[PDB]
Paper text:
The antiapoptotic protein myeloid cell leukemia 1 (Mcl-1), which is associated with high tumor grade, poor survival, and resistance to treatment, has emerged as a promising candidate for treating hematological and solid cancers. Herein, we report the structure-guided design of small molecule macrocyclic Mcl-1 inhibitors based on the (R)-methyl-dihydropyrazinoindolone scaffold our group has previously disclosed.
To understand the binding interactions of the macrocyclic inhibitors, the X-ray cocrystal structure of 13 bound to Mcl-1 was obtained. The X-ray crystal structure of 13 confirms our expectations that the single macrocyclic diastereomer produced cyclizes from the top face, avoiding the steric clash with the lactam (R)-methyl group on the opposite face.
Author numbering: -196 to -25, -19 to 320
Amino acid sequence: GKIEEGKLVIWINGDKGYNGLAEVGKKFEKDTGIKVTVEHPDKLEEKFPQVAATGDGPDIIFWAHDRFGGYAQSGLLAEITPDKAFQDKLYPFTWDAVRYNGKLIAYPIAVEALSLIYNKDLLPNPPKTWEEIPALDKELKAKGKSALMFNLQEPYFTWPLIAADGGYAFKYDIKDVGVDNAGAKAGLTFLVDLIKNKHMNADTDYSIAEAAFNKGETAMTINGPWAWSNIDTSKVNYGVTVLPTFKGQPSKPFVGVLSAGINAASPNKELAKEFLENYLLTDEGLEAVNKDKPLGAVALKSYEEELAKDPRIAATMENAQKGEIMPNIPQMSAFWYAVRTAVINAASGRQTVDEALKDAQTGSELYRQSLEIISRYLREQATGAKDTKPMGRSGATSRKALETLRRVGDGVQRNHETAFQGMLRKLDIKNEDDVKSLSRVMIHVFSDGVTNWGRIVTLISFGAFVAKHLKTINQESCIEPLAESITDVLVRTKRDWLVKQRGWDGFVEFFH
Ligand SMILES: COc1cc2c3c(cc(C(=O)O)n3CCCOCc3nn(C)cc3-c3c(Cl)ccc4c(CCCOc5cc(C)c(Cl)c(C)c5)c5n(c34)[C@H](C)CN2C5=O)c1OC
Ligand SMILES: OC[C@H]1O[C@H](O[C@H]2[C@H](O)[C@@H](O)[C@@H](O)O[C@@H]2CO)[C@H](O)[C@@H](O)[C@@H]1O
């Protein structure tokens, strides 16, 4: 073991009410004598997978639900089994946000959506459209002010505009990605044109936009409920309202459900359950957090009935209903990373909107595309017959890549039979547990050195060799897990190289 028994360590983002959470933890300690430590480390959503994979990390992690599926896919989250009485206290759709493969993998805390925050002393009537913001910025520049400033370094904040005219992440399946259609292009182009016409600055981040709004220098910002507290201390006469439309269409923020997941490696799962169910998700626990930094529309019905009277919460829910609940599928991280880079590169001029979004599309589709190819190859190699299913969207790439792989990988498997048999014997794979064990070994062997298509063909060809072995020892059910694991090792460790090669299209070109 590694996580200490007898206490609770919690991770929550630095923009949330961690002091109020610590107050709840101090009440928990007063009752039980169990010390609760709340930390807010930088990049905790990226740090948690790494440290939890090795059995460390916090007992409880707080984040929006979109990441948790990935954590659940990697075995890092304990299953949540609250009884009906407690489940009935929270809104069903918040439970739906934290369900993964039919299992509850977190407690939902609160519903978050971005709104347009505006300075009533500068803008008694905020703009209803994105399109009128350039003229409004000219009017405000005439008097020493600016129209709008918001964080351009995180794609969460730009996504409402990208999605307004038809951009989307995953259609409601990981095969259909819409970050590079005409609507996404139109939204990102509007943002880039705002920057080129000096209505916004490409370097603007969270701190810069927050400081400019709370000092009264800019008339609008885009942000979530957690920010209201600081504005309250600013004494700016502010309102919270619906996001402007773009091309006559509502802005569509990605809706997050702040949720608390229990580390699968924690020896304090019953303590964490008691704390979350009977201390935090109460009227007084949620209030203690909310008084620090507002949570949004909390999942607890009794408290949300009080919070819903707040016009700021009504606007939050109006924008949420115009938006969409985030998926929790494990590729969300990759998606976000891709879009993050796109927005930044588009805003700085390092790429055009077309180039940036094409790269984002490649990055977002990489997992499913690689998985389709590798799975089909491994299954047809192990059984001697091919999958009859249609290739689907971007199916030309998958078909062509599978043909290329058939050629090159049967060459590799013929030539490298001795080393392959040796490593297969040295690994000794017998069941589903050893295949789940294979991933750290795979990362080690696939590590350092050069990255080329031939090494990837070697990875996949040895995967096919192992799939053949699994078929022989009557373990066909292990082939699809194996394939998945291989995919995860490939797309994660070689993400940037793969995107630079245009992905499997570059694979196909290289061996043409
Ligand atoms: C140190 O840096 C490296 C290492 C490697 C390189 C290159 C460049 C190329 C290339 O140009 O093709 N290769 C592949 C050469 C194939 O060598 C055959 C070879 N011999 N022995 C003595 C053992 C091997 C050997 C074997 Cl049996 C099987 C797979 C590999 C791989 C793929 C990564 C790991 O996969 C998987 C691993 C596991 C546990 C599982 Cl369950 C699955 C499902 C997949 C590599 N290997 C392999 C050798 C070490 C070279 N290797 C590799 O990645 C490189 O850069 C300078
Ligand atoms: O920008 C990508 C980022 O978006 C969302 O993160 C939000 C988070 O949900 C909010 O609670 C608040 O903290 O702002 C974050 C943006 O900086 C996704 O939840 C996250 O996974 C993703 O990386």
